[PDB]
Design a protein around this ligand. Structure first.
Ligand SMILES: CCC(=O)N1CCc2ccc(-c3ccc(C(F)(F)F)cc3)cc2C1
Length: 217
C-alpha cells in the first residue's frame, strides 16, 4: 500500500543512530538511516517493482538465501529499501550506536528478527533479536528500543566516515548490503523480508530513503 508490509507484519519505523551525552542533562542523536511512520494516502503511487533475481548476488546464496526465501514466500512480504545515509555528524569515546524499530500486526506473535550484514554478497555478521507483542490501538506493536550495534558496523561507519570524498563512500557502499528477515519465532513462517541497499546522501540534505516491492517474473 506504499507501505513496507505483508499481510501479517508491517514495519512502522526504522532508525540507525549514534547518541552522545553533551552534559549530564543533555543528549545529542545523529541518525544515519531512517524510515518514519507514515500513514498511507489514497493518492500515493503504487510501489515500483524490482526483479528479485537482479539482487540475488548481493546477499548470500542457498540456504537462508533470498532465492530460497523468495521460493518459500509469501512473495507479498519481500521489500527492497534504498537508503541515502547521512554521514555528516557535527557530533567521541562513549557514544552509543543503536538501532530502534517498530512493527505492527493484527495478530499477536513472538517475532524473531534476523539481520545479516553483507560484503560483496558474503555474510559478515548475523544478529538475531526476539521481540514481543504489545496491544496498542487496534493493532499489536513490536518495539525494539536502542538495540546496540555490533562492532563490525561501528568500525564500518567510522572508517567509512573517514573517507575524504562522498563519491568514494558510495563506491564502497555499492557492495555493502543488509538483509532483514522477520519470522514468527516458533513456526519460522516468513512475515517480512527487507533487502537494504545504501548510498551516501550527496546533498548533505538529511537522510532519505525509497521503497520498492521485490517481484519474480
Ligand atoms: C549486524 C547488525 C547491525 O549492527 N546493524 C543492523 C541495522 C543497521 C542498519 C543500517 C546501518 C547503517 C548505519 C550507517 C550507515 C552509513 F555509514 F552509511 F551511514 C550505513 C548503514 C547500521 C545498522 C546496524
Amino acid at each position: 500500500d506504499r507501505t513496507i508490509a505483508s499481510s501479517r507484519l508491517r514495519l512502522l519505523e526504522y532508525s540507525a543512530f549514534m547518541e552522545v551525552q553533551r552534559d549530564p542533562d543533555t543528549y545529542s542523536k545523529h541518525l544515519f538511516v531512517h524510515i518514519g511512520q507514515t500513514n498511507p494516502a489514497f493518492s500515493d503511487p503504487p510501489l515500483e517493482a524490482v526483479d528479485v533475481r537482479q539482487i540475488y548476488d548481493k546477499f548470500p546464496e542457498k540456504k537462508g538465501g533470498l532465492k530460497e526465501l523468495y521460493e518459500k514466500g509469501p512473495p507479498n512480504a519481500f521489500f527492497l529499501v534504498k537508503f541515502w545515509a547521512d554521514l555528516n555528524s557535527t557530533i567521541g569515546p562513549g557514544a552509543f550506536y543503536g538501532v530502534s524499530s517498530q512493527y505492527s500486526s493484527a495478530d499477536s506473535m513472538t517475532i524473531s528478527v534476523s539481520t545479516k550484514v553483507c560484503s560483496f554478497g558474503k555474510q559478515v555478521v548475523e544478529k538475531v533479536e526476539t521481540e514481543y507483542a504489545r496491544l496498542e490501538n487496534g493493532r499489536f506493536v513490536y518495539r525494539i528500543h536502542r538495540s546496540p550495534m555490533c562492532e563490525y558496523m561501528i568500525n564500518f561507519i567510522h572508517k567509512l566516515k573517514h573517507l575524504p570524498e562522498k563519491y568514494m563512500m558510495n563506491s564502497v557502499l555499492e557492495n555493502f548490503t543488509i538483509l532483514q528477515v522477520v519470522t514468527s519465532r516458533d513456526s519460522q513462517e516468513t512475515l517480512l523480508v527487507i533487502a537494504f541497499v545504501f548510498e551516501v546522501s550527496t546533498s548533505e540534505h538529511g537522510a532519505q530513503h525509497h521503497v520498492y516491492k521485490l517481484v519474480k517474473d
